[PDB]
Design a protein around this nucleic acid. Structure first.
Ligand SMILES: Nc1nc2c(ncn2[C@@H]2O[C@H](COP(=O)(O)OP(=O)(O)OP(=O)(O)O)[C@@H](O)[C@H]2O)c(=O)[nH]1
Ligand SMILES: Nc1nc2c(ncn2[C@@H]2O[C@H](COP(=O)(O)OP(=O)(O)OP(=O)(O)O)[C@@H](O)[C@H]2O)c(=O)[nH]1
Ligand SMILES: [Mg+2]
Lengths: 339, 918
DNA sequence: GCATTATCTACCGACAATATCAATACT
DNA sequence: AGTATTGATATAAGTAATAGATAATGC
C-alpha cells in the first residue's frame, strides 16, 4: 500500500550526515520475521510507534505495510533527508514531524505541551503493548546519545516512565561489540555493565561476516543473527552496522552509588581487586579488606566482575561510615581561577 | 625591634642616611641566613611545638610526626640505590625497580639530605591545595613536577653556598618526575589522620585513623586525570586561626638592595639566580634573549628594571592592626569570606524528572561548589598574607622584578607584593618620606577622591569632594571600627583607609606643608590600549576620545558605550521586552569595560559573554546561574559598538593578516631535504619583532609534543622542553594584536621608570598605573608625557613592516593557480625541464631546493661568480617581473600587506593635556 | 566551482589526560 | 628466544557552550 522508496530514488540524495541505512526489502522481511512482534503485541491496531532518525524511511514503509499501526510518527529535521521524506510520503497515513530527536525539550514539547503524540501508560511488570521505539543512530558522532538513553532507562524519566518500552536500535558494529561484551572479554567496559544491569539486549542482524569474531562465541549460538553484506546499504563508505532489541528489566540498587563505584573501578580494569579499591576513597583498601571474608573475590579483576558482584561492592560501599561525598567528584577548570 | 619607628624619629636626613647604611650592612647577614637556612627553621618550629605539646598549633604537632616517620623510609630507599651502583654491572635484574628504575633516579636521590627531602615534599604538597581544578586536592603531574623542581633548586642553592664558602646542567623532566613520585609515594603511606564517622545502620558514632592523602582518578569530557586528594580534616585544619611557620614561602621579599640587572641571567636574589623572562617553556626565546644580551642591546630594559626593583617599601602599621582586629572577629567582612563550615545545596529533584532538569540541578551544584571553594581559597590567602606581613613588620623590604616574554614587569615575590588585591595594596607604604609642599596636600585629596570611585570628574571637583567629606574622613580615621565606617563604602577600602589615616593626621596639624607622607599616589592611564592605537594610526577622533588632545573635562570611551547600550535597552524596554526592563539601569562603565577593551584585541562572543556574566555577579543584578541575561547584554554591546573603532580595527586586521601570512611561510634552509613524510612540508616560522627598547619578542606558540613517562604512582603526560614543533597557526594569528600593544605599554613604562629614577623620585608601576610620592606627581606627569612623546614620535607600524620585510626576505608561501593561466602556465614548462636533467618530474621540494643555492650564488662576493648564478630563472624568480600577486599548486613569495594610512595627528600636543594620566 | 557539511577553539598574561594492548621492533 | 619500546584505541556522555574561522567533500 504505502509507496516504499527504491534504490533508484534514494541514490539522488547528496548528504546523509554520516548515517547508513538498509534498503533491501528482503532483509527487512527476514528481520521482521525473526523479531516476531506478533507474540508480544496482541493488538497492533492500538499500537503507537515512535520512529527516530528515519532517514530514507524504507523501514517505516514496510513496518506500516505489515502491521498498520494506528499512529506512526517520524522525527527528522536534517534538511536533505527531510525534503525526500516530505516529497515521497505525501498523501500517506505516516505523519512526518520536523523536530530533532537530540534535544531533550522536543519530546516534552511534543507529548505534554501540545499532545501531538501521547502514548498509553502501562505497569512495570510487562512490556508495554501500546508503545514501541525505533531508532537509527549510526553515525560515529552520535554515540553519546545511545548512552544517554541507556541511562534514562535507569532513571525512568525520558520515555521509560510509561513502562518497559521496547526499542529497536541501529548502531555501529563497534558500539554493539562494546555493549554486548560478556565478562572477561577484551571489549568489557562500563557500558557493558550498564547494558547488563538495565537491559536484556539480543542481537538481531549484523552487516558483516567477520565482525562476528569479536562477539562472544557462545552467545551467537543463542541468537543466530541474520548475516548479510555491505552491498544492501547505500552509503558504503562507513563501518558495519547492527540491530539490537532492547527492553528494560527491573532492578533494586542505588543507581548513584553503583554508578560511582563502577566508574571508579573500571578505570583500572586490569589491576587485581587486591589494590584497586584503594581509589574509591581515603583508606578504602583496608575497609574493603576487612569486610570481605572470602579471599577469592579479591583476586578477580574489574574486567572479570559480574554485575551482581558490582552490586555487592556497592552495598559494601554504602555501609561504609567514612564514605566520601560522591556529589563533589568533578573538575572545575573554566569555572575556577586561583589567585 | 621595629626600625621604622627609629627612622622617623631622627631629626635630619644625615642621621637617617647613616642609619640606613649601617642597617643595610647589618641586614646583609640576616638576608644571607634567611635565604639558605629557612627550612631548618621550619623543622625547629615543628620540633619545638611537638615538645611543648608533649610536655603538657595542632597542625605543627602532626607535621613533625610525619617527618620523623617518613625519614626512616627515605634512608632505606637511598641505601638500596647505592647497593646497585656499588656493583659495576649486573645483566639479569628484576624489571620492577632494580633493573632500570633504581638505576634511573639513583644518583639524583643521593645528592641532598633525606630530612631536607622530607621537608620539601611535605611543604610542596601542603602548598598545592585546590589547584588544577581538583575540588579538595591537586593534579598528580603538577605535584610531582613541583616537588622535583624544588629538590633541584635546593641542590643548586646548597652547591653554590658550598662553592662560595670553601674558597646534568638542568635535570630532565623525565627525571624530575620520578623523584617527586618516589617521595610522594612514601608520604602517602606514612601520613595518618584521625577521622570521626557516623554509622549508617546503627547510627553509632565512631573514630578511626585514615591516610591523610590519597591518589585517585577523575574524568573531564572523556579524559582521565590523576589526582591527589586531601582528607577533609586537614582542610578544616588549614582554615584555623593562623599558620605561623608551617608553610613559609621560599621566594619572599628581600631585606637589602636587590642585585642589579647587568645580564639576562644575573640579577635579583643573592643566592638565587632568576632568568629575565618568565616564559621558560620555549628554548627559542632563551636563544634570542641570550643573543640580544651578548651584544648589549637591552641596556634600557636593565635600567628600567633596576629602577623599579630598588624602591624600598615598608609594612603599614595601623592598617595591619585594623585587619588583625577584623580577622579575629571570625565573621565575613568587606572581602574576607568568613569561616563557613558546611555549605548549602538545594534538595535534589525527583529522579523521574526530565533529564534537562537533572542536568540544570547538576550545573547549579557545580556553581555552588566553586563559590564555596573560591571563598575558602580567598580566606586562606588572606591569612597567609597576614602571616607574611607579621614577621616583616617594621622591616625594610625590596621587590625585585622580572619580565614575561613581552616586557611587562612583575615582582619575583608572588604572594605578598603590591600587585595583589586591594588589601595587599593597603599594607604597603614608602620608607622614604617626602614633605607635602604646596601640591602634596591637593594630590593626596585627589588620590582619596580617586579611591572613592569618583575619578572621572575634573580635579577641582575631586578636591571639593574631599573637602566636603573631611568630617567623614576624620570620623572613619579616628575609630575605624565601631564608627560610621565610611571607608567601607569606598570602591577600594583598604587603601582609602590608609589615605583617611594620613589626611586625618594632616588636618590635625596647622601647617600641612611640614608633614612627611609615605602614602603612594596612583596615576592610571585612561583607555591605555586605545591610547596606543590612537597614537599609532594618528587618528584625531580616536585621540580626542581617549584624552590625548588637551581638554577641560575627562572623556572616556567606556561611559559612552554604556550610555549607548542603556538607551538601546530603554528603547527596547519601551516596546514590551521583558529582559530589558530589568537591565534598564544596571548598565555602567564597569559592566561594559572589558568587552570594549578587548574588542580591539579579538575577543570572541563566548569570551565576551563570560566577561559580562562575571561582571554582573558583584552587583547581583541576577544570580550566579542566571547567565542568560549576559547573552542578551553582549549581543547589544556588539551591536552598539559595531561601528565605533575603525582606525583601530585597521591596524588589528593588518597585524592579523601579517601573522597569518608569516605562520604559513617556509624558508629555503629548513626545507633542505624533504622529510618524506608528505608532499606538503611543515611550517616552523614564528612571529618575531623587537621592542623599541631593543628587547626581542618571540611568540612561543607551537604544537604540543607530549608523551607518557612512567612513575611510581602513574604514567604522567608531560612535554619535552627541547622539542621543536610546527607553530600553532591559530595562536600566532590571535596573539599578535594583544602582544604588540602590551609590549608597547611595557616599553613606555620602562622608559618612564628609568627617567624618573634618574630624576630622583621613588617609583613603582602597575602596568598602566604609576605610583610616586604625593609631592612628586607634577614631575612624574611631565616625565610621562615626555616619554610617551619620545616613544611615539617615530612611526612604529611602518618600522614593524620594514623589520618584518628585512627579517623574512627569502621565505616562500604555497598557493594555487589555474593550469591555463599564462603566469602559472610558464612554470609547467619549467616543470618539464627537470624531466631530462634530473630524470624525474619536478616536485615542490626540488623546486624549493633549487633556489636555495642560487641565493648563495647571488651573494657570492665575486662579480664573475654573480653572473654565473644570477642569470638563472627559477619558478620563484618568475614573480619578480610583476607585483600584483593577489589575483595545481605553485610557490609564491612572502609579500606582506600595505600598512593602513596614517592620519595627520601631532603627538606633542598631548604634553599640555592633564587628563592623559589621572 | 561553489556550496553545503565537518572540525575546532574560545583576546593576552609561565603551568598540563591515562590505562590497556596489539604489534612490531630488536636486543 | 627474548624483552622493549611505539603507536593506537577507549574513556564520559549534553565540556560552562555557542558562534565564527577553516578545513573538507560531493556532484
Ligand atoms: N588583552 C587584554 N589586555 C587587558 C585586559 N585587561 C587589561 N588589559 C591591558 O592592561 C591595561 C590596564 O588598563 P586598566 O587600567 O585595567 O584599564 P584601562 O583600559 O586603562 O581603562 P581605565 O579603567 O579607564 O583606566 C589595559 O589598558 C590593557 O592594555 C584584558 O582582559 N585583555
Ligand atoms: N593582562 C591582563 N591583565 C588583567 C586582566 N584582568 C585584570 N588584569 C589586571 O589586574 C589589575 C587589577 O584589576 P582591578 O581588580 O579591576 O583593579 P584596578 O587595577 O584598580 O582596575 P579597576 O578597579 O577597574 O579600576 C588591573 O590593573 C589589570 O592590569 C586580564 O585579563 N589580562
Ligand atoms: Mg587604565
Amino acid at each position: 500500500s504505502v509507496p516504499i522508496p527504491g534504490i533508484k530514488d534514494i541514490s539522488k540524495l547528496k548528504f546523509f550526515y554520516g548515517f547508513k541505512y538498509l534498503w533491501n526489502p528482503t532483509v527487512y522481511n527476514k528481520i521482521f520475521d525473526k523479531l516476531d512482534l506478533t507474540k508480544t503485541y496482541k493488538h497492533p491496531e492500538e499500537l503507537k510507534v515512535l520512529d527516530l532518525y528515519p532517514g530514507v524511511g524504507i523501514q517505516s514503509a514496510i513496518f506500516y505495510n505489515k502491521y498498520c499501526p494506528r499512529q506512526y510518527s517520524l522525527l527528522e529535521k536534517r534538511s536533505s533527508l527531510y525534503k525526500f521524506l516530505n516529497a515521497k510520503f505525501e498523501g500517506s497515513p505516516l505523519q512526518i514531524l520536523k523536530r530533532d530527536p537530540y534535544d531533550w525539550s522536543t519530546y516534552s514539547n511534543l507529548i505534554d505541551e501540545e499532545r501531538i503524540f501521547v502514548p498509553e501508560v502501562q505497569s512495570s511488570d510487562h512490556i508495554n503493548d501500546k508503545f514501541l521505539t525505533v531508532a537509527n543512530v549510526t553515525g560515529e558522532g552520535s554515540e553519546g546519545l545511545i548512552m544517554q538513553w541507556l541511562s534514562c532507562i535507569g532513571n525512568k524519566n525520558w520515555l521509560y516512565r510509561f513502562g518497559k518500552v521496547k526499542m529497536l536500535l541501529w548502531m555501529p558494529s563497534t558500539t554493539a561489540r562494546k555493549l554486548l561484551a560478556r565478562p572477561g572479554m577484551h571489549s568489557r567496559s562500563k557500558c557493558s555493565v550498564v547494558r547488563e544491569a538495565f537491559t536484556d539486549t539480543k542481537l538481531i542482524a549484523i552487516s558483516d561476516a567477520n565482525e562476528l569474531k569479536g562477539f562472544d562465541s557462545q552467545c551467537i549460538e543463542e541468537w543466530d543473527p541474520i548475516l548479510f553484506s555491505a552491498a544492501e546499504i547505500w552509503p558504503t563508505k562507513g563501518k558495519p552496522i547492527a540491530l539490537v532489541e532492547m527492553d528494560p528489566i527491573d532492578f533494586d540498587f542505588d543507581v548513584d552509588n553503583w554508578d560511582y563505584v563502577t566508574r571508579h573501578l573500571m578505570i583500572l580494569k586490569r589491576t587485581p581487586l587486591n589494590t584497586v579499591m584503594d581509589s574509591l576513597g581515603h583508606g578504602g583498601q583496608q575497609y574493603f579488606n576487612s569486610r570481605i571474608t572470602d579471599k577469592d573475590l579479591l583476586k578477580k579483576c574489574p574486567i572479570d566482575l559480574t554485575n551482581d558482584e558490582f552490586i555487592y561492592l556497592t552495598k559494601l560501599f554504602m555501609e561504609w561510615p567514612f564514605k566520601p561525598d560522591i556529589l563533589m567528584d568533578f573538575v572545575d577548570m573554566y569555572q575556577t581561577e586561583h589567585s | 625591634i621595629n626600625f621604622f619607628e627609629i627612622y622617623n624619629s631622627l631629626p635630619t636626613l644625615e642621621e637617617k642616611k647613616a642609619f640606613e647604611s649601617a642597617l643595610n650592612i647589618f641586614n646583609q647577614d640576616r638576608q644571607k641566613v634567611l635565604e639558605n637556612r629557612a627550612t631548618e627553621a621550619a623543622r625547629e618550629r615543628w620540633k619545638h611545638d611537638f615538645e611543648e605539646a608533649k610536655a603538657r598549633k595542632n597542625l605543627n604537632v602532626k607535621l613533625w610526626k610525619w617527618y620523623n616517620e617518613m625519614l626512616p623510609l627515605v634512608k632505606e630507599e637511598i641505601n638500596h640505590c647505592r647497593s646497585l651502583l656499588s656493583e659495576k654491572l649486573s645483566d639479569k635484574k628484576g624489571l620492577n625497580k632494580v633493573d632500570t628504575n633504581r638505576l634511573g633516579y639513583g644518583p639524583y636521590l643521593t645528592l641532598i639530605d633525606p630530612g631536607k627531602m622530607c621537608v620539601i615534599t611535605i611543604l610542596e604538597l601542603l602548598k598545592l591545595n585546590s589547584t588544577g581544578g581538583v575540588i579538595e586536592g591537586m593534579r598528580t603531574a603538577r605535584a610531582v613536577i613541583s616537588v622535583g623542581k624544588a629538590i633541584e633548586m635546593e641542590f643548586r642553592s646548597e652547591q653554590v653556598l658550598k662553592s662560595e664558602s670553601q674558597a646534568k646542567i638542568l635535570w630532565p623532566q623525565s627525571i624530575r618526575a620520578r623523584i617527586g613520585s618516589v617521595l610522594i609515594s612514601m608520604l602517602i603511606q606514612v601520613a595518618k589522620v584521625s577521622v570521626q564517622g557516623v554509622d549508617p545502620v546503627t547510627k553509632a558514632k565512631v573514630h578511626g585513623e585514615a591516610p591523610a592523602f590519597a591518589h585517585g582518578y577523575q574524568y573531564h569530557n572523556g579524559s582521565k586525570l590523576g589526582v591527589l586528594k586531601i582528607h577533609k580534616t586537614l582542610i578544616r585544619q588549614l582554615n584555623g586561626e593562623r599558620l605561623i611557620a608551617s608553610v613559609q614561602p621560599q621566594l619572599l621579599p628581600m631585606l637589602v638592595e636587590p642585585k642589579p640587572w647587568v645580564n639576562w641571567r644575573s640579577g635579583g636574589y643573592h643566592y638565587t639566580q632568576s632568568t629575565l623572562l618568565r616564559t621558560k617553556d620555549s628554548p627559542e626565546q632563551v636563544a634570542y634573549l641570550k643573543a640580544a644580551s651578548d651584544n648589549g642591546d637591552i641596556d634600557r630594559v636593565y635600567d628600567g628594571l633596576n629602577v623599579l626593583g630598588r624602591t624600598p617599601w615598608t609594612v603599614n602599621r595601623k592598617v595591619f592592626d585594623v585587619v588583625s582586629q577584623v580577622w579575629n572577629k571570625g565573621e565575613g567582612f568587606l572581602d574576607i569570606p568568613g569561616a563557613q563550615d558546611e555549605m548549602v545545596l538545594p534538595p535534589a529533584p525527583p529522579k523521574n524528572s526530565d533529564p534537562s532538569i537533572l542536568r540544570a540541578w547538576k550545573l547549579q551544584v557545580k556553581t555552588i561548589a566553586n563559590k564555596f571553594s573560591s571563598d575558602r581559597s580567598n580566606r586562606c590567602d588572606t591569612n597567609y598574607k597576614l602571616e607574611i606581613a607579621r614577621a616583616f613588620l617594621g622591616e625594610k623590604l625590596y621587590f625585585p622584578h622580572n619580565l614575561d616574554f613581552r616586557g611587562r614587569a612583575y615582582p619575583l615575590s608572588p604572594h605578598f607584593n603590591h600587585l595583589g588585591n586591594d588589601m595587599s595594596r593597603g599594607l604597603l607604604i614608602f620608607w622614604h618620606g617626602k614633605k607635602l609642599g604646596p601640591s602634596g596636600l591637593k594630590w593626596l585629596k585627589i588620590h582619596l577622591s580617586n579611591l572613592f570611585g569618583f575619578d572621572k570628574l575634573p580635579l577641582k571637583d575631586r578636591v571639593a569632594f574631599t573637602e566636603s567629606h573631611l568630617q567623614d574622613i576624620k570620623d572613619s580615621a579616628e575609630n575605624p571600627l565601631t564608627g560610621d565606617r565610611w571607608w567601607t563604602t569606598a570602591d577600594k577600602p583598604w587603601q582609602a583607609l590608609a589615605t583617611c589615616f594620613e589626611l586625618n593626621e594632616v588636618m590635625k596639624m596647622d601647617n600641612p606643608e611640614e608633614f612627611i607622607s609615605h602614602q603612594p599616589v596612583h596615576q592610571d592611564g585612561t583607555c591605555n590600549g586605545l591610547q596606543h592605537y590612537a597614537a599609532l594610526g594618528g587618528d584625531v577622533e580616536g585621540a580626542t576620545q581617549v584624552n590625548l588632545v588637551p581638554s577641560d573635562k575627562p572623556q572616556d570611551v567606556y561611559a559612552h558605550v554604556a550610555r549607548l547600550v542603556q538607551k538601546r535597552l530603554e528603547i527596547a524596554a519601551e516596546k514590551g521586552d521583558e529582559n530589558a526592563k530589568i537591565l534598564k539601569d544596571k548598565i555602567t562603565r564597569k559592566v561594559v569595560k572589558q568587552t570594549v577593551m578587548t574588542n580591539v584585541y579579538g575577543v570572541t562572543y563566548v569570551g565576551a559573554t563570560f566577561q559580562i556574566a562575571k561582571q554582573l555577579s558583584p552587583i547581583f543584578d541576577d544570580r550566579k546561574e542566571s547567565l542568560d541575561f549576559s547573552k542578551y547584554l553582549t549581543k547589544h554591546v556588539f551591536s552598539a559598538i559595531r561601528e565605533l573603532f575603525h582606525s583601530a580595527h585597521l591596524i588589528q586586521d593588518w597585524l592579523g593578516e601579517s601573522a597569518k601570512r608569516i605562520s604559513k611561510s617556509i624558508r629555503l634552509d629548513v626545507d633542505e631535504k624533504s622529510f618524506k613524510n608528505g608532499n606538503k612540508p611543515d611550517f616552523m616560522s614564528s612571529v618575531i619583532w623587537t621592542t623599541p627598547l631593543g628587547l626581542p619578542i618571540v611568540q612561543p606558540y607551537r604544537e604540543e609534543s607530549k608523551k607518557q613517562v612512567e612513575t611510581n604512582l602513574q604514567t604522567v603526560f608531560i612535554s619535552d622542553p627541547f622539542a621543536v614543533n610546527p607553530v600553532n597557526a591559530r595562536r600566532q594569528k590571535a596573539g599578535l594584536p594583544p602582544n604588540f600593544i602590551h609590549s608597547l605599554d611595557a616599553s613606555h613604562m620602562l622608559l618612564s621608570a628609568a627617567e624618573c629614577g634618574k630624576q630622583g623620585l621613588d617609583f613603582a608601576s602597575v602596568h598602566d598605573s604609576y605610583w610616586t610620592h604625593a609631592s612628586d606627581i607634577d614631575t612624574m606627569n611631565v616625565v610621562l608625557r615626555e616619554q610617551f612623546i619620545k616613544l611615539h614620535e617615530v612611526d612604529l607600524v611602518l618600522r614593524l613592516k620594514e623589520e618584518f620585510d628585512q627579517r623574512y626576505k627569502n621565505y616562500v608561501k604555497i598557493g594555487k593557480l589555474k593550469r591555463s593561466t599564462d603566469l602559472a602556465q610558464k612554470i609547467i614548462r619549467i616543470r618539464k625541464d627537470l624531466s631530462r636533467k634530473l630524470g624525474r618530474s619536478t616536485t615542490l621540494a626540488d623546486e624549493i631546493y633549487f633556489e636555495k643555492k642560487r641565493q648563495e650564488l647571488l651573494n657570492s662576493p665575486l662579480i664573475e661568480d654573480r653572473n654565473v648564478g644570477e642569470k638563472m630563472v627559477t619558478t620563484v624568480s618568475l614573480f619578480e617581473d610583476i607585483t600584483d600577486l593577489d589575483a595545481m599548486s605553485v610557490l609564491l613569495p612572502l609579500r606582506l600587506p600595505e600598512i593602513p594610512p596614517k592620519g595627520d595627528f601631532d603627538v606633542t600636543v598631548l604634553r599640555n593635556s592633564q587628563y592623559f594620566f589621572s
